[PDB]
């Protein structure tokens, strides 16, 4: 089988680990524990081809910035994540994530991924973000960012409900195989 390396990046708490773990082990972590760094293995079949995906998880917290470049060498595809409960996480895509991945992973395709899409309909999220004059990130603005940064693709998912998760990894695998 073909081996490919996937690296996920994005703001702290934006759902990276839950996405990788739902996809690699079909389980959703109950308690939020910030990542330091670690990786996973998943087998995937896409378009008839068998691929062993290595899924490299990174810490989004700025406190672990110095560790992130440990994961980037020899990456075949980048999942660049934000979450819909955090408008700031989308703003940080062009301000932080794009420049960093361009530097360390030149010419590696980027899938821009909106995580936690279930929270668009969560009344508590909507109520509290509205209290702060915000709202869940809308598809149109994710897509616009994907155009701005010339992402290989734009996808939305929920690790919690599993909606869209397989498609993120199928699309990433295609990007890695191109």
């Amino acid at each position, epitope marked *: 089988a073909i081996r490919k390396k996937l690296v996920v990046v994005g703001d702290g708490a934006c759902g990276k680990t839950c996405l990788l773990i739902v996809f690699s082990k079909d389980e959703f972590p109950e308690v939020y524990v910030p990542t330091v760094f670690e990786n996973y293995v998943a087998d995937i079949e896409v378009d008839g081809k068998q691929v062993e995906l290595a899924l490299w998880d990174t810490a989004g*917290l700025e*406190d672990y910035d110095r560790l992130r470049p440990l994961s980037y060498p020899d990456t075949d595809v980048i999942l660049m994540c934000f*979450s819909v409960d955090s408008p700031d*996480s989308l703003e940080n895509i062009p301000e932080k994530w794009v420049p960093e991945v361009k530097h360390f992973c030149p010419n590696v395709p980027i899938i821009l991924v909106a995580n936690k899409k279930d929270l668009r309909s969560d009344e508590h*999220v909507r109520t509290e973000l509205a209290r702060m*004059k915000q709202e869940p990130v809308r598809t149109d603005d994710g897509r616009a960012m994907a155009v701005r940064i010339q992402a290989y693709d734009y996808l939305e998912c929920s690790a919690k409900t599993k909606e869209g998760v397989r498609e993120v990894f199928e699309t990433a695998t295609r990007a890695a195989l191109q």
Partner: nanobody
């Protein structure tokens, strides 16, 4: 799994007063050390005040609110109050209460599975 809920916010004139309340709900280990946090558009989330196991006037206060804000416990109702006096425009923010722990002090988004209800305080001419 115990979650802290904020109430008592409103519109106030500069120099007025307001008392916020932080109530506990859900099941789990008691929260011994809790804090008040506030969030205004554009600025970073700000720690305001906290109270732990020791009663009395010595508590934890941001310099921004020292002498104007007083944090205390109801002694009967498992509720923390933030008495806010001499309010100023700079105090306008959405106020939340939460346990004091590594997750609540970390520089990252509000996780609404962990934060409860906020309460808006607007100070205005």
């Amino acid at each position: 799994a115990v979650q802290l809920q904020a109430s008592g916010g409103g519109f106030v004139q500069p120099g007025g007063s307001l008392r916020l309340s932080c109530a506990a709900s859900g099941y789990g280990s008691t929260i011994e050390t809790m804090g008040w946090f506030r969030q205004a558009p554009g600025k970073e989330r700000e720690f305001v005040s906290a109270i732990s196991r020791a009663p009395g006037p010595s508590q934890y206060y941001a310099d921004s609110v020292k002498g104007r804000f007083t944090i205390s416990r109801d002694n009967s109702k498992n509720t923390v109050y933030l008495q806010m006096n001499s309010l100023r425009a700079e105090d306008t923010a959405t106020y939340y209460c939460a346990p004091i722990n590594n997750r609540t002090m970390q520089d990252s988004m509000f996780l609404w599975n962990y934060w409860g209800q906020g309460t808006q305080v607007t100070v205005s001419s």
